[PDB]
């Protein structure tokens, strides 16, 4: 996995790759690693996919309940508190490294959260197995008050670095731009990997080539 | 693996399956588990394929030099003793070998089971591999010393088929060789057990067979 | 990690490095290890980030409760009514290089009527850490000002013991390298400038010698009436020899 | 208070082999990797032993390099001593001896020895790092073997198909190998980048190159 | 050697229009303790070959002594400049050493770069070899050396060995390697190569706890092997959010 | 180890077990009777494993099934009985496992003669022939070979005789004493066989 | 893993043009190499448009199927409507994660139809795969699970063809399953293939290898 | 244990504590960790006492061999021909308290004709330690004077690596506490008195902060022509604050 996030002027840009791996085997080529917590808050996940999916769904629905009850705008700090308290409660056994980004009254905010329940407020961050390549790109090219387009290009470059230098990363580049008034989720954003060789014609098996022992037909009503 | 051998009124019947595996992955379905050590001795191998093949070739070299020097054919007992002593010298190193040596010599038809632990058991009927128990049951339920060649070949084929059917480590093709005074013949070069199942257990092919 | 606290004539100065690392990789370049519990109370964290952060969150919640319950009924202090500045720009100037590196705020509770006590907060933290010392592993330095004992430093050690320091406290992996330096250079009733220079130099030496210490330097100066905070980025150590 | 050092690593790789009436094909991916990193994107896994024989190995790169060099040295010494080039069967026995010599500290290498013999028939030998098996039609070693071997079984043996096909030629076989390596690159993280395809036939050894996904 | 005690961090070597540029920081760490701050981690084998290491200093010194004596024997037997050993030869030697020690399970806890010029057609430096006096420290232009005439090779603990246009060890193998796979190009000038290497070293200094910004650069060119004057890399933070005071953030929550 | 054998035909079910009660290196009894649990309404649970777990699980299941049948004034179906047994074994697997193998035989009008094979991990499935123990390796192929549809009770008993002879001849534990339960013609019969 | 190797088993799912297919191996194993049953189906019908293929430990398969049937039946009786395929997939994910730290050793797939209303109704093929703690992979072409996952992935990557009628879909899925099973020691002994069409379901047993 | 070496303008000064402890018990109160290899060559030992002592014995034997082989044939230097004092009594004076605490001897080899080289002895020691680094665990500081490189300090580290120090070297558990102190206080071309005070203070601070360092302080001053040795027993650390 390569997930990353950065803060540009009045927006937070998150990016992710789309590969899920079961040992050395790619279990999913186009998994979605960017999750909507609220209209102004999103997260990117790395680690154990089941833990990430369950925890992000739980956070999303708890945040929506809180928003309905308080009748106010959700807060990245509230998401951070809930997530860190849960992860600490489980003592790192829910393997969830999260890049949580959102815009609230305090402006754009980006957090890195680690499985044991620590958090840090950052201008940019990267997590996953490709995190070191993404961090190389981000450290080389990041600057304050970048335009949204520049931030999108930088996030794409970081995720591509992760994809092409880490064996646990691959697929497409998904991006999400979060502002105080809207989010734009581009999936896919790059599509840099495709199967390169195809046979001249697809192999269509002739009818009746498979031997069968029995055939029962039932009609659905 | 399923390898078996037994003495009967016309010589020795030797039979094997053809499946190799690493873990749960079937690496091959056409390996040769019966080898000829010399003109009048056949060895059936089970366990570690590399160990079995290497040490059978070693035994063949030793037997060739012995026969060249002494102008006589080696006996199955002597070959089994040589192999067992060699294997015992490596006890505690991890060799995996179960070899049935069956042959004809001046003392008639002889058959020995040799292990990597240095065992050497003389006998009239042996079976080795992960299907050995199933092959043993089938052979014991219907064995007779006065079987004709065709009956003996059928018994060996049936035992190998049942071993392959019940054991996940055995399968592929079944080979049956016949050792007689003048050498050995390959009665069944290799026969897919697919046809054996659909001829023995599910001849009708009207539904899935229920074990 | 290096966290230090020093008591000078008119206040208490806390300082810290800002490197959080997972082994040899630096996960956070510039973390925030000095954290405000109350307007007049700060804590420096060392050890596991998750442990120290969650403990400090709980303690901030407790301190809010304590401050609310400390308030008395009525009106008070009706007839009663309650220096050298650090050249931070000069300190940070580098030839080869809208940046904010200094903050200052005055206490809202001028008379310390309801502000909790440094000892109270430190001891509740110690009790929390000791009840779970089978799991938690963090070391804290509480620096604060209260009207009873004035400026105070408390060390909450690993395993959950508490020692009040009357001169200075150090903690983290980098403090070992500056142990004798600080012992030699410390004196009683230092001025603000002397204390600032000493604590900055201590953090700089610790960062020079310790691989787990790096980044910028954060300093908090707590006094009777206000709190100042500085960030130092001129952290390189230059030796003539 | 030190941790023990493990003398084995896997550097990834896939080597496929496919025989024909008078030709043999050996394809191998060129990526070299260590855990989740790439050491280099071009580390050939196939070495030429004779004008009619090559060997491709997958496993620990240092073991593969040493073993290929040792085999080449043995073959050159054989040529000098017995004044003729060994054929693939002699080379197979030689490699078997070399491999069992280290039986109790085996080379971490799975190897396919491909060649054409005096009858002009394609020959493949599969080595599990200690022993040899002659492969009738096709073989595969490395990380993608479990993905690839079923495909080649379906396309070559066609045992589970009543309506079978038998027109097998060099171009169609090359296309089959390309498809197999591409499909393996789809799901195997250690297979990718470039692949080298060697065809040995009456005219000798010819090497072509195919591009794979770089993720 | 059961394991690393005193260690050096990453090394970076690249090809450029005039030869090899190899860089490493002059720091050796005894754990998390930066005990030695002026350590030499790049060694000259001969006039066309250098060796860089990351890992145990003791094993690196052992290998350096082996290579020094190998070079002395080569020089003793030399009759013409073509007789001098090449970087490829030394890379093969080191790879064989590592392989044998792996087989014995007595490894050197090191990753090695062997770099240099694989040709004798660009200068006459090996006509008269001086070991104890460096005439370089009288300035003629550098020679544009073909990329195929240059050599950079990598050897690891398990004997895995290869060569490329640029080689990295340690954490460079992530940060500098990403930057090089993005931005490296053929026939870079000296200043461009130095700028790329400096970017890589700055990222390493920011993200690697065992590195320093006291850098040693070595150039293998037609002039021979040149050690540059060690310099302090300027490393400034790339964001003002780092410097923003903590007291200016909201006092509630996990703002740290 | 206790060898259990089960054979299901169109008109019968035969269960067989060795009659040894083993305690370390000595046989407490050659006529053990702690393996068969007959349950009213033509059901039988044949258990194999440690005697303590065998007794506890067998009696628990038998008393629960008898309670069900008394409370509901009806005979539990064989499928319900088998899956109830499997559900209880699975429930206890992750808490305090019984180390018992089960052959569940029975007859009912809805489904006729039924045989279910269940292992100590609670992996169950209905079968025509099954076995448990280290003698399974030696009797399974005999069952496979000599079993056919439309087999009779006497032919099944001949197959069982072959199995017992094999267990006496080739099995490490020379087992010679067996008990058989035969369900056919809505009657349950007990037999004792010695080879 | 070894717990999956204890029984073996594999499930596969493929999509066509207005049809889906779900296939499974019919073996039940013991100790990773003993075949005790050859009719242990791993495909379960939840309702007309939802099928689940469960592979892994047999006891966990049966337990999970009972739980899923309980939940689906309660949901459907309460709502007076058939459960949606997406709703069932999410419920299965949540059930699997509810045992996160003591999980069921089952690797399931969900194959079915998503119904879209406009008059007429549109049937959209739906495939999902899971890991044992509910991580979900939603796919449009094919899903695999079991000990034969690598072989199935290779076969489906090479042979899957988009937008096939029921006949071509059946041929493709059966060929993929048979070729993948031929290379697994602990899977096989018969294959069951269901082809779902909006108006009918075709159930076929394949003439497979039994070795 | 604390061993230090410093290079000043006219020589090299080694210093050490003298505590050998088996855990928390002090087996030897006043051990001798600075040992003479040759008249102009000394070694400070740290780590396992058995390992360092046996290594030093072997190296002394080797150095005897080297010195014997270094002697040339004939006569030499026919026409050729080849100070602030430390107040040791004042340094050791204690109010609440035939004692010998100072020695001095001149080199017999005035011209360094056959005395072995500091680098040679240090490198043979390093080779011996590296060949058995699977077993041996000791750290050594060689301080010496030879006519080629004058005063020299070599550090032979754990695992058998050698680093020449041109300013100072430290080793042992107590050196960590004085790392920054020595770095701050050191300067180039110190006088003998400055170097003596600095090294004495370094050992005193290390002993104050380290439980494994204690006892008296032994100092050896190696110069071009002689070697002086001092024992300091006024090791208590007094802080005004
Ligand atoms: C990033 C990689 S990494 C190396 O940095 O951990 C990804 C992040 C990821 C993948 N998918 C999502 C979805 C949403 C958010 C984030 C996501 N992580 C992974 O891919 C996991 C890496 C391992 C090392 C933990 N892989 C998984 O969790 C596996 C996913 C999976 C396996 N089979 C499947 C079938 C269908 C769909 C998904 C999968 N799962 C496992 O490894 C299962 N283990 C079992 C034991 O408990 C832990 C999970
Ligand atoms: C019988 C099975 S058994 C369970 O009774 O041991 C067979 C007997 C057999 C197989 N092949 C031959 C050839 C000649 C004579 C006899 C033969 N035994 C096996 O198949 C082995 C079973 C293991 C448990 C010991 N398997 C093997 O030895 C593997 C064979 C193999 C591996 N890759 C191949 C590719 C093609 C053809 C065959 C093979 N080899 C190993 O498992 C050795 N491992 C390989 C992985 O690295 C470590 C060594």
Automatic annotation (TrEMBL), chain A:
Reactions listed under catalytic activity: Cleavage of peptide bonds with very broad specificity
Keyword flag Nucleotide-binding: no
Main location, first listed in the record: cytoplasm
Any one annotated GO CC term: nucleus
Signal peptide as annotated in the record: none
Gene Ontology BP, a term: ubiquitin-dependent protein catabolic process
Family (UniProt): Belongs to the peptidase T1B family.
Localization terms from the record: Cytoplasm; Nucleus
Keywords on record: Cytoplasm, Hydrolase, Nucleus, Protease, Proteasome, Threonine protease
Top-level taxon of origin: Eukaryota
Function recorded in the entry: Component of the proteasome, a multicatalytic proteinase complex which is characterized by its ability to cleave peptides with Arg, Phe, Tyr, Leu, and Glu adjacent to the leaving group at neutral or slightly basic pH. The proteasome has an ATP-dependent proteolytic activity.
Quaternary structure (record): Component of the proteasome complex.
Active-site residues, Swiss-Prot/TrEMBL: 1
Protein name (database record): Proteasome subunit beta
GO molecular function: endopeptidase activity; threonine-type endopeptidase activity
UniProtKB/TrEMBL annotation, chains C, H:
Protein name: Proteasome endopeptidase complex
GO molecular function, one term: peptidase activity
GO BP, sorted A to Z: proteolysis involved in protein catabolic process
Record key words, sorted: Cytoplasm, Hydrolase, Protease
Species this chain originates from: Plasmodium falciparum (isolate Dd2)
Keyword Protease: yes
UniProt GO cellular component terms: cytoplasm; proteasome core complex
InterPro entries: Ntn_hydrolases_N, Proteasome_sua/b, Proteasome_suB-type
UniProtKB/TrEMBL annotation, chain F:
Keyword Hydrolase among record annotations: yes
Entries under InterPro entries matching the protein: Ntn_hydrolases_N, Proteasome_alpha, Proteasome_beta2, Proteasome_bsu_CS, Proteasome_sua/b
Protein name (Swiss-Prot/TrEMBL): Proteasome subunit beta
UniProt GO molecular function: endopeptidase activity
Subunit structure and binding partners: Component of the proteasome complex.
Family matches, as Pfam families: Proteasome
Function: Component of the proteasome, a multicatalytic proteinase complex which is characterized by its ability to cleave peptides with Arg, Phe, Tyr, Leu, and Glu adjacent to the leaving group at neutral or slightly basic pH. The proteasome has an ATP-dependent proteolytic activity.
Top-level taxon: Eukaryota
Subcellular location: Cytoplasm; Nucleus
Cited PANTHER family: PROTEASOME SUBUNIT ALPHA/BETA
Keywords from the UniProt entry: Cytoplasm, Hydrolase, Nucleus, Proteasome
Keyword Thylakoid: no
Taxonomic placement: Eukaryota, Sar, Alveolata, Apicomplexa, Aconoidasida
Major localization listed first in the record, in broad terms: cytoplasm
Biological-process GO terms, alphabetical: proteasome-mediated ubiquitin-dependent protein catabolic process; ubiquitin-dependent protein catabolic process
GO cellular component: cytosol; nucleus; proteasome core complex; proteasome core complex, beta-subunit complex
Entry similarity comment: Belongs to the peptidase T1B family.
UniProtKB/TrEMBL annotation, chain G:
Compartments where found: Cytoplasm; Nucleus
Gene3D superfamilies reported for this sequence: Glutamine Phosphoribosylpyrophosphate, subunit 1, domain 1
Main location: cytoplasm
Matching SUPFAM superfamilies: N-terminal nucleophile aminohydrolases (Ntn hydrolases)
Disulfide bridge map: 156-176
Keyword annotations from UniProtKB, A to Z: Cytoplasm, Hydrolase, Nucleus, Proteasome
GO MF, one example: endopeptidase activity
Gene Ontology cellular component annotations, sorted alphabetically: cytosol; nucleus; proteasome core complex; proteasome core complex, beta-subunit complex
UniProt cross-references to InterPro entries, sorted A to Z: Ntn_hydrolases_N (IPR029055), Proteasome_beta_3 (IPR033811), Proteasome_bsu_CS (IPR016050), Proteasome_sua/b (IPR001353), Proteasome_suB-type (IPR023333)
Keyword Hydrolase belongs to the record: yes
Pfam (any one): Proteasome
PROSITE patterns: PROTEASOME_BETA_1 (PS00854), PROTEASOME_BETA_2 (PS51476)
GO biological-process terms attached to the record: proteasome-mediated ubiquitin-dependent protein catabolic process; ubiquitin-dependent protein catabolic process
Domain of life where this protein originates: Eukaryota
Protein purpose: Component of the proteasome, a multicatalytic proteinase complex which is characterized by its ability to cleave peptides with Arg, Phe, Tyr, Leu, and Glu adjacent to the leaving group at neutral or slightly basic pH. The proteasome has an ATP-dependent proteolytic activity.
Complexes and interactors: Component of the proteasome complex.
Family of this protein: Belongs to the peptidase T1B family.
Name recorded for this polypeptide: Proteasome subunit beta
Organism: Plasmodium falciparum (isolate 3D7)
């Amino acid at each position: 996995t390569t997930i990353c996030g950065l803060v540009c002027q009045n927006a937070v840009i998150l990016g992710a790759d789309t590969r899920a791996t079961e040992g050395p085997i790619v279990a999913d080529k186009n998994c979605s690693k960017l999750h909507y917590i609220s209209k102004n808050i999103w997260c990117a996940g790395a680690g154990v996919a089941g833990d990430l999916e369950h925890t992000t769904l739980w956070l999303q629905h708890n945040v929506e309940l809180h928003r309905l009850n308080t009748n106010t705008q959700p807060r990245v700090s509230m998401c951070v508190s809930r997530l860190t308290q849960e992860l600490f409660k489980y003592q790192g056994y829910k393997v969830c490294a999260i890049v949580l980004g959102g815009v609230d009254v305090n402006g754009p905010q980006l957090y890195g959260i680690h499985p044991h329940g620590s958090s840090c407020l950052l201008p940019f961050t990267a997590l996953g197995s490709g995190s070191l390549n993404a961090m190389a790109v981000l450290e080389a090219k990041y600057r304050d008050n970048m335009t949204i387009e520049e931030g999108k290009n930088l996030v794409c470059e970081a995720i591509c670095a992760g994809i092409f230098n880490d064996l646990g990363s691959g697929g497409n580049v998904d991006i999400c731009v979060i502002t105080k008034d809207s989010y734009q989720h581009i999936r896919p954003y790059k599509e840099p990997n495709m199967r390169l060789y195809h046979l001249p014609h697809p192999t269509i098996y002739p009818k009746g080539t498979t031997p069968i022992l029995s055939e029962k037909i039932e009609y659905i009503k | 693996t399923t390898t078996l051998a037994f003495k009967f009124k016309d010589g020795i019947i030797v039979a094997v399956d053809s499946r190799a595996s690493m873990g749960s992955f079937i690496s091959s379905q056409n390996v040769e588990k019966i080898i000829e050590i010399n003109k009048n001795i056949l060895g059936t191998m089970a366990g570690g394929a590399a160990d079995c093949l290497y040490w059978e070739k070693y035994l063949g070299k030793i037997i060739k030099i012995y026969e060249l020097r002494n102008n006589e054919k080696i006996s199955v007992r002597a070959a089994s003793t040589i192999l067992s002593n060699i294997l015992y010298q490596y006890k505690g190193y991890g060799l995996c070998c179960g070899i049935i040596l069956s042959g004809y010599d001046h003392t008639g038809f002889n058959m020995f089971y040799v292990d990597d632990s240095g065992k050497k058991v003389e006998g009239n009927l042996f079976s080795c591999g992960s299907g050995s128990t199933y092959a043993y049951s089938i052979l014991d339920s219907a064995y007779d010393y006065n079987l004709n060649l065709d009956q003996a070949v059928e018994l060996a084929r049936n035992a190998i088929y049942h071993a392959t059917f019940r054991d996940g480590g055995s399968g592929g093709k079944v080979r049956v060789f016949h050792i007689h005074k003048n050498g050995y013949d390959k009665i069944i070069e290799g026969e897919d057990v697919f046809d054996l199942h659909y001829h023995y257990t599910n001849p009708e092919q009207k539904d899935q067979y229920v074990m | 990690t290096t966290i230090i606290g020093i008591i000078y004539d008119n206040g208490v100065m806390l300082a810290c490095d800002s490197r959080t690392s997972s082994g040899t990789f630096i996960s956070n370049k510039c973390s925030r290890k000095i954290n405000r519990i109350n307007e007049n109370l700060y804590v420096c964290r060392s050890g596991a980030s998750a442990h120290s952060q969650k403990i400090i969150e709980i303690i901030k919640h407790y301190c809010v409760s304590m401050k609310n319950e400390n308030r008395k009924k009525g009106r008070f202090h009706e007839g009663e009514t309650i220096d050298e500045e650090i050249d931070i720009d000069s300190i940070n100037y580098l030839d080869y290089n809208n940046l904010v590196t200094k903050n200052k705020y005055f206490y809202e509770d001028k008379f310390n009527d309801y502000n909790p006590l440094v000892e109270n907060v430190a001891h509740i933290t110690k009790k929390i850490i000791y009840t779970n010392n089978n799991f938690l592993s963090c070391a804290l330095i509480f620096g604060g000002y209260d009207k009873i004992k004035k400026q105070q430093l408390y060390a909450v050690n690993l395993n959950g013991s508490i020692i009040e320091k009357h001169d200075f406290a150090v903690s983290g992996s980098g403090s070992i390298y500056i142990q004798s330096y600080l012992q030699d250079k410390y004196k009683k009733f230092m001025t603000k400038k002397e204390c600032f220079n000493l604590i900055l130099n201590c953090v700089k030496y610790a960062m020079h010698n310790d691989n787990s210490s790096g980044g910028l330097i954060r300093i908090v100066n707590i006094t009777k009436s206000f709190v100042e905070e500085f960030t130092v980025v001129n952290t390189q150590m230059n030796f003539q020899y | 208070g030190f941790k023990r050092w493990y003398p084995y690593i896997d550097n990834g790789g896939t080597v496929i082999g496919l025989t024909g009436k008078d030709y043999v094909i050996l394809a191998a991916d060129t990526r070299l990797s260590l855990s989740y990193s790439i050491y280099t994107r071009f580390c050939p896994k196939i070495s030429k032993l004779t004008d009619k024989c090559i060997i491709g190995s997958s496993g620990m790169q240092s073991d593969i390099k040493t073993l290929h060099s040792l085999l080449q040295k043995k073959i050159q010494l054989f040529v000098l001593e017995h004044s003729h080039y060994p054929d693939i069967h002699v080379i197979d026995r030689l490699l078997c001896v070399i491999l069992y010599s280290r039986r109790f500290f085996p080379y971490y290498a799975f190897n396919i020895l491909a060649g054409v013999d005096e009858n002009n028939k394609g020959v493949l030998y599969n080595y599990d790092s200690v022993g040899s098996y002659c492969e009738a039609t096709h073989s595969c070693v490395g990380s993608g073997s479990q993905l690839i071997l079923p495909i080649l079984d379906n396309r070559v043996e066609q045992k589970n198909q009543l309506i079978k096909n038998t027109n097998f030629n060099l171009g169609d076989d090359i296309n089959f190998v390309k498809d197999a390596i591409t499909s393996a690159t789809e799901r195997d993280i250690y297979t990718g980048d470039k692949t080298l395809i060697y065809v040995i036939d009456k005219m000798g050894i010819n090497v072509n190159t195919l591009d794979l996904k770089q993720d | 050697t059961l394991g690393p005690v005193v260690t050096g961090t990453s090394v970076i070597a690249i090809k450029y229009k005039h030869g090899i540029m190899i860089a490493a920081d002059r720091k050796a760490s005894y754990g998390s303790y930066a005990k030695f701050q002026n350590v030499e981690r790049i060694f000259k084998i001969n006039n066309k070959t250098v060796m860089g290491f990351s890992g145990e200093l003791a094993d690196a010194q052992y290998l350096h002594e082996l290579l020094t004596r190998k070079n002395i024997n080569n020089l003793s037997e030399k009759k013409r400049k073509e007789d001098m050993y090449t970087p490829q030869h030394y890379h093969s030697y080191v790879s064989r050493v590592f392989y044998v020690r792996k087989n014995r399970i007595d490894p050197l806890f090191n990753n090695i770069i062997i770099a240099g010029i694989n040709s004798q057609k660009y200068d006459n430096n090996d006509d008269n070899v001086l070991l104890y006096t460096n005439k370089n420290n009288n300035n003629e232009e550098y020679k544009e050396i073909h990329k195929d005439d240059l050599y950079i090779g990598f050897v690891d603990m398990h004997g895995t060995n290869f060569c490329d246009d640029y080689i990295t060890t340690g954490y460079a193998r992530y940060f500098a390697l990403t930057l090089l796979r993005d931005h490296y190009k053929d026939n870079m000038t000296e200043e461009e190569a130095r700028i790329l290497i400096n970017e890589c070293l700055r990222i390493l200094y920011f993200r690697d706890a065992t590195s320093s910004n006291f850098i040693q650069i070595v150039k293998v060119t037609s002039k021979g092997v040149e050690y540059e004057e060690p310099y302090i890399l300027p490393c400034v933070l790339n964001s003002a959010d780092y410097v923003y005071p903590s007291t200016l953030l909201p006092p509630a929550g996990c703002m740290w | 180890m206790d060898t259990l054998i089960g054979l299901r035909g169109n008109n019968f079910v035969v269960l067989a077990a060795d009659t040894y009660s083993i305690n370390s290196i000595i046989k407490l009894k050659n006529d053990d009777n702690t393996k068969f649990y007959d349950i009213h309404g033509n059901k039988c649970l044949l258990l194999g494993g440690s005697i303590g777990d065998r007794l506890q699980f067998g009696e628990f299941i038998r008393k629960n099934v008898h309670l069900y049948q008394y409370q509901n004034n009806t005979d539990m179906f064989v499928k319900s009985f088998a899956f109830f047994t499997r559900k209880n074994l699975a429930y206890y697997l992750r808490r305090n496992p019984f180390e018992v193998n089960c052959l569940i035989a029975g007859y009912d009008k809805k489904d006729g003669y039924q045989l279910y094979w269940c292992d100590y991990l609670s992996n169950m499935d209905s079968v025509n022939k099954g076995a448990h123990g280290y003698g399974a390796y030696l009797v399974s192929a005999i069952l496979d070979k000599y079993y056919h549809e439309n087999l009779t009770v006497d032919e099944a008993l001949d197959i069982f005789k072959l199995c017992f002879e094999e267990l006496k001849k080739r099995f490490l534990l020379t087992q010679i004493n067996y008990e058989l339960r035969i369900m056919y013609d809505n009657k349950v019969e007990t037999q004792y066989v010695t080879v | 893993g070894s717990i999956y190797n204890y029984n073996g088993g594999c499930v596969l799912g493929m999509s066509g043009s207005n049809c889906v297919a779900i296939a499974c191996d019919l073996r039940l194993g013991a100790n990773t190499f003993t075949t005790v049953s050859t009719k242990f189906s791993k495909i379960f019908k939840m309702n007309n448009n939802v099928y689940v293929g469960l592979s892994g430990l047999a006891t966990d398969i049966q337990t999970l199927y009972e739980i899923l049937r309980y939940r689906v039946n309660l949901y459907e009786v309460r709502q007076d409507a058939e459960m949606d395929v997406e709703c069932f997939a999410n419920m299965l994910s949540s059930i699997l994660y509810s045992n996160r730290f003591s999980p069921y050793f089952v690797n399931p797939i969900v194959v079915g139809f998503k119904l879209k209303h406009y008059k007429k109704v549109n049937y959209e093929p739906y495939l999902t795969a899971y890991d044992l703690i509910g991580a979900k992979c939603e796919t449009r072409d094919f899903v695999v699970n079991g000990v034969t996952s690598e072989q199935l992935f290779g076969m489906c990557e090479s042979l899957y063809v988009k937008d096939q009628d029921e006949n071509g879909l059946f041929e493709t899925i059966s060929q993929c399953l048979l070729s993948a099973l031929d290379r697994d020691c602990i899977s096989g002994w018969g294959a069951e293939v269901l082809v779902l069409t909006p108006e009918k379901i075709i159930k076929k047993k394949l003439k497979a290898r039994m070795d």
